[PDB]
Amino acid sequence: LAPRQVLDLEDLVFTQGSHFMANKRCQLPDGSFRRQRKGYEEVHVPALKPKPFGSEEQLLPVEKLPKYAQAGFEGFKTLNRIQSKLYRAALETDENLLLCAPTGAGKTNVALMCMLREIGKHINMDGTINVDDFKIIYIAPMRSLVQEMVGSFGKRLATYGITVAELTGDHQLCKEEISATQIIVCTPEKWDIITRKGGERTYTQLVRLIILDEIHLLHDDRGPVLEALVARAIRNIEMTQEDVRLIGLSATLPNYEDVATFLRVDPAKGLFYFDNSFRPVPLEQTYVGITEKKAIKRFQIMNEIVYEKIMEHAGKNQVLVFVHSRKETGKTARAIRDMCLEKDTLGLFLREGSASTEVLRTEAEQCKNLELKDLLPYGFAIHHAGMTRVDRTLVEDLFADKHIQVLVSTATLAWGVNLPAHTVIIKGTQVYSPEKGRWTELGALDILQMLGRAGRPQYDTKGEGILITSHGELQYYLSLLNQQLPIESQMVSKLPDMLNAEIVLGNVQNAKDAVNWLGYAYLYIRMLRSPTLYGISHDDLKGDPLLDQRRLDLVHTAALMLDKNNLVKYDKKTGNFQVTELGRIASHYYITNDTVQTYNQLLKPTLSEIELFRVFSLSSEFKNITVREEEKLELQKLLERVPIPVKESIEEPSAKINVLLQAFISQLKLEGFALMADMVYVTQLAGRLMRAIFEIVLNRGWAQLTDKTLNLCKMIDKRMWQSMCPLRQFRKLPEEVVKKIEKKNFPFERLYDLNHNEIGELIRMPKMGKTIHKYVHLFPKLELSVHLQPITRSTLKVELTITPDFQWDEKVHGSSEAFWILVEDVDSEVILHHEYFLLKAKYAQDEHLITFFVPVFEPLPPQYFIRVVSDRWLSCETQLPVSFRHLILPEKYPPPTELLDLQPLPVSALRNSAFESLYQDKFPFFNPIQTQVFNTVYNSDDNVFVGAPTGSGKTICAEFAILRMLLQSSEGRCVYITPMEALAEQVYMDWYEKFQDRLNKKVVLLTGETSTDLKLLGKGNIIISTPEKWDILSRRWKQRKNVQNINLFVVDEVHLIGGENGPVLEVICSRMRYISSQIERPIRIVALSSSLSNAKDVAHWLGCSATSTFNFHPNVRPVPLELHIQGFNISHTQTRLLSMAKPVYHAITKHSPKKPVIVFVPSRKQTRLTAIDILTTCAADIQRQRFLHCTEKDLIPYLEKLSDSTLKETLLNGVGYLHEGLSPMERRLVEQLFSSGAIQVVVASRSLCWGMNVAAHLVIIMDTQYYNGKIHAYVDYPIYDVLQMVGHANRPLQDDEGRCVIMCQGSKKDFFKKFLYEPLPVESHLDHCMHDHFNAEIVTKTIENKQDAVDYLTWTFLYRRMTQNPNYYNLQGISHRHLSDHLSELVEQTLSDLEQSKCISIEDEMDVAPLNLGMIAAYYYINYTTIELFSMSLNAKTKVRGLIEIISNAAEYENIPIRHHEDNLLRQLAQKVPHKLNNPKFNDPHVKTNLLLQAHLSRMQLSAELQSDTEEILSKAIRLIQACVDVLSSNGWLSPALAAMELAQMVTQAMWSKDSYLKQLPHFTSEHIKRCTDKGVESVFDIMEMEDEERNALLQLTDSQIADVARFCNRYPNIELSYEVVDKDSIRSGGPVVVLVQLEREEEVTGPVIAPLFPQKREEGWWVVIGDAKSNSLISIKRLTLQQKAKVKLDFVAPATGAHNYTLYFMSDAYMGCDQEYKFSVD
């Protein structure tokens, strides 16, 4: 890299700040005349005549202006002279503009027209405007001007339904008032703070137009912030490639074109410059400089000059005087009034208009305080911001209405309000500047503004500007006000802070990045056009025209500064930057680097509040504050009144600052001017600086100093010491009241126990007694509850339940309340864990559960402490000791099985050549894991456990066991179970083409349906299944032989046993252990797993011996892993995500710049977005297509088969993505391209980490939480899901290593740092899912009594772990006795619950038996509570409406997710469905399924994920409906039962109860029905009996339409029924009555049931039913499948005597309207 040079930075800089002039000479216009007065020199320049109207230079009227821009212009008939040249520029082009004009010329309306244009392209046809589509930024230099603008602009655009809102000050992470607004108005340094925050593209993404008002501020010491701002923005336009319009508004000053360059303005098309001949009113300006320095006489001289100047106006004229003190307005107004009453008493009577009128108006307003009463009767008045109230806005009135004759006012009036005067006289021009620590000349920006108020636009002809100042070196002002003071760049002054900001953002990563950034600065353009002025020689410039040396030297110098102060780690060699937490905080809280060093140096855990106050005063933003003599006395008084001792700071500036702050909190009235100005300064800085110290110390875990610092933050905010009364924080509560309660030695906590009457009776003030009670209960108060379960001997899982215990009030609490959860050691010295909890208003009084892990150490202490502290409220916290007194730590886990460094095992150890073949073509030798394992699995016929990290090759370890089975047995059968369906389908693909193609042995994959699955188990050598599918088969293992005689049983990913749905896995694996040892032909168990801590427990459970148990440590992983965990201390997920964007790219380029990359993101929407970001970042880096490793031409043939539109675009750029909205085809395509090498990067959603057969070199996990709409919260990725993600970063054949970067919220970092490197512990949750499996065992009669239930548990993993980690399973005791006790108390509850729910019967306490409800739940695999609710909610008159409600309330649909902002989506659907729901809470999955079910019936296409959810719903719908039939028929109800069967078919075909049966046929629309309704065809029976020529002539056909419908009626069941009553003649009461039903189809043709709008491929089902229609009674029932010919018998019992009238029913569960009816009689 290039050599660098350390720079004398202080030399290169412009020391004079805004006052600096590289102006040299100064030419005056034609009026030159100088009128000396010995004591002071006078200089005049005359008003300018107005330039001539050019050829076709007319003034455009609003009439001609576009009809949509008319609004916001009532109050205007025509356009200004300036505004005419710019109408095309502003409203007809999107070109960047730079406008220069006299202040007052009307540049603002030009900015307004530009706004209108951006609004112009959001007109939305009928709907008036697209308010939520865009945003405009208006950057103004003064807070007073901003509020002025929000006012004016707010009126204009109110007719557009558009909102413009203020946003400047101390707004840290602003509220949703910025998300609602469309025009943001603010100051530079505000906007800078916002766009530094890392999460910024949420405020700025929508921003289409930003406006820089008074951009000459560039010249000021605030100048850099503008440069920083614009450089930052411009660079972003390049990155996102989203065009943003820049508009500059400046005053007529030199260098304007350099500024236009800076703004990327086209000199030909966007530069508009208007010299001072374009003023609103022509200006007669007068400048006077006091020659002599007699300072007392100075005021006397100065006040004499104002005197005579005012006199030359009197009766008809109006004067404005500007001075520079809140109190100087009063002095001056009275000083002149007395002056002109003792110096020849020149008439104030000469002032009051007429001879004595309007004097009564000025007297009728005289009843107002603040020395205004004294001036108003006369001709004088005053205006200042400082504490002036409504009077301020009334002096404004009378001046504007021309009653007030002489107004002297502070500068803020020039910005705050548009009231101009005929003549303006600026007095003195000196200002006390706190940060400079002295008196200096005021800003060039301020002078211009106020002196631009000379002459009222509609009532004046000439304006008179008088400028009184020092003669000494202030011809500078002539330069300013006559187009001659040049605009320079002040960047060097603020370089290292400005650099640091970008570094923290990720915008610059190295000196090179930096040096490029500098090129965006106005600094760069000036150094070019004026190199000598900036210390560059003419010779350097010609040799280095792009200033590559200087910009690197500049950067290098500032880099060393940030390094010295530890804001940034920088090495001179590579030139790379690393960001530190110190520099991160620095940038975020806007504090200079030198301060951060001081804090880093002085802070320490044991800091006292005394030393704390000391430290704050060493802040470098105070480095200029001195202690003046004229204020030493008053400081001494303050020091004696303030509470915190100030050591030996004595009369140093440190002491001054320290007590100034204390005085502020004590609310001490101050007296000394300047001393007040100083106080204001350190107080506004005090929030940030403290909050910064808080974060520094929070992060280091310093418990005590964290508490001190947060409290100090709150004292400054709430202006009260910590000892005072919490009630003071209520600002609407009489301050004498609070003083009364304070002086009582009374503890605040005791106020909660008193009522309004007792309160007053103790304050001795019975009036306020009731309103205090109101406030006490408004005060934030939380209850904390804790639950503990130890994980290892080093970490415990803590479940904190916070519960709000107060009344909410949006005018007191706002929309939320922030807290900090702090968990600390016994000594309360260390913060062990911490996180930020946010109580949103909507969910106040709602339960909040917070989970997290904490470290524990060898000899445990009694307790830890959880403290929950308000972020804003003083004396507002809640503490909770977490006792360890009864804590039993789990047993020490055994070491990992050692990795023997055996020499690698070649494929030749496998003998069989048909075997070796499917391996030899792949890899040369076996990894150290497979070699070590081999011997035991391929040679032995016994049980074995393998525990290695994912990516280690355990799959083929399992395959070893399978080869042996095929070797040892001809048609042997092995069962293989993976916990995930997407994994099941992955192995089946691998194994089918491995075992049925290569080895010619049938390989099968189980499905939902029982009958067809039974068949597959039969013909299969290799069986593949998820645990749930295998459970419903093996549940009846007695009745099924094929389950019993299986040779081999492989369990993969057995660590998932500790996850959700872990129970079912554990139950089946135990069922195999039970069976195997119960038939004496031992089944071989082979279990594969991630590295376990407690593998001994698993092996002993599954029959493995220690030796044949292979649990390796994660470091054993064949491809070594490089893990990096990157925390983000950002709580708001959307923000966290957005600020992870740049770090994702930067990670690719660092860790895997060439090799492939997978990025996981939490959602489908994120998947598309992150991809697009990577592209745009890439193209901005000038790379464009560095992730495409083929040519675009090569891809076209594949991308032709894509319809997504956008991954077509992204893949073309080398980046793909994956979610579940993509077609299975679209997925396969993308994966293929990735494995091939064509694309380097795919972004996949978290859900697809299980369904991906793709490996990268680098895996990036972007955030680790997903939103769960049910509990309105974000929840963590299961560790299982993350272990998997990381496994994707291994490619054994191509990389020397795998790399993983996890990006997570900071509160999560420490958790990942343990459970990724170390082995994993696992527990059972069988006990929390114990009912359904017991209920099934009692049905199968494996559990015949209570003892058998205890015996059954002895085969489970649960049984092993209860002894090893008792507190996890809440075994309050320890071992041996408590164990038998707890087992028996567990079986007791479950049987009780099952008995109470009608599922089982308990007889003699010991014995159990299945009941009806229990039989139906075991059969259909339905949770027992579902059928409890089914039998509880189904009556005699339930119809298909109530049936849907009941079925959707199934416990099965509980797990249906509610995603972010679907509550708005579901709310819409509800007001669009046939059957309305009452009180339907839209975070309830049941409410969701209910609507999603109607939408499916109503053939509605909707959101992608909703159709995707509908699929998971329908997938369980059938078994649920069938269950309902069973219950209604078990209860003898006729009506509901039949309607329930209708539901079964109408679900399958997706149609309603009275929808035309014509909808069963493909391609038919709702209009095709009425062209058959009128025609005479309203049935499917009709279209089958009419000839073919007449059939296709009916409606519109195609060749492929005829093909689909033909095959439809080749499977539409043809029905005919014959029946006889056996012994029809001889039948009596109480005797059996047999009805023999004959069934046969004539189709002969059969096949898969066609129901296009149904995700499952289901089979035909039929119910034959007998009932009494008259009395609503179901008499007999039988379900079957046709098989072409069938004989169904079903008998019942006869009534007392006579003959009855019955009905015979024949219903389908699949097709609509095949149903037959028959009336018959017996006896």
Ligand SMILES: Nc1ncnc2c1ncn2[C@@H]1O[C@H](COP(=O)(O)OP(=O)(O)OP(=O)(O)O)[C@@H](O)[C@H]1O
């Ligand atoms: N001896 C070997 N040499 C090189 N590559 C191998 C070897 N054995 C397996 N592989 C490959 O390594 C990849 C990872 O192996 P595998 O899928 O078995 O991981 P695992 O450790 O079993 O965990 P999981 O199966 O849960 O991902 C597979 O794609 C496989 O093809």
Ligand SMILES: Nc1ncnc2c1ncn2[C@@H]1O[C@H](COP(=O)(O)OP(=O)(O)O)[C@@H](O)[C@H]1O
């Ligand atoms: N077409 C117009 N008709 C009447 N008044 C105008 C017109 N254009 C601008 N003005 C007035 O000129 C005054 C000063 O102009 P402003 O828009 O504040 O820009 P600037 O002061 O930055 O030049 C404003 O009070 C505004 O009302």
Ligand SMILES: Nc1ccc(S(N)(=O)=O)cc1
């Ligand atoms: N300021 C801050 C925000 C969030 C977090 S954390 N640890 O909850 O993510 C810490 C500090």
Ligand SMILES: [Mg+2]
């Ligand atoms: Mg595996």
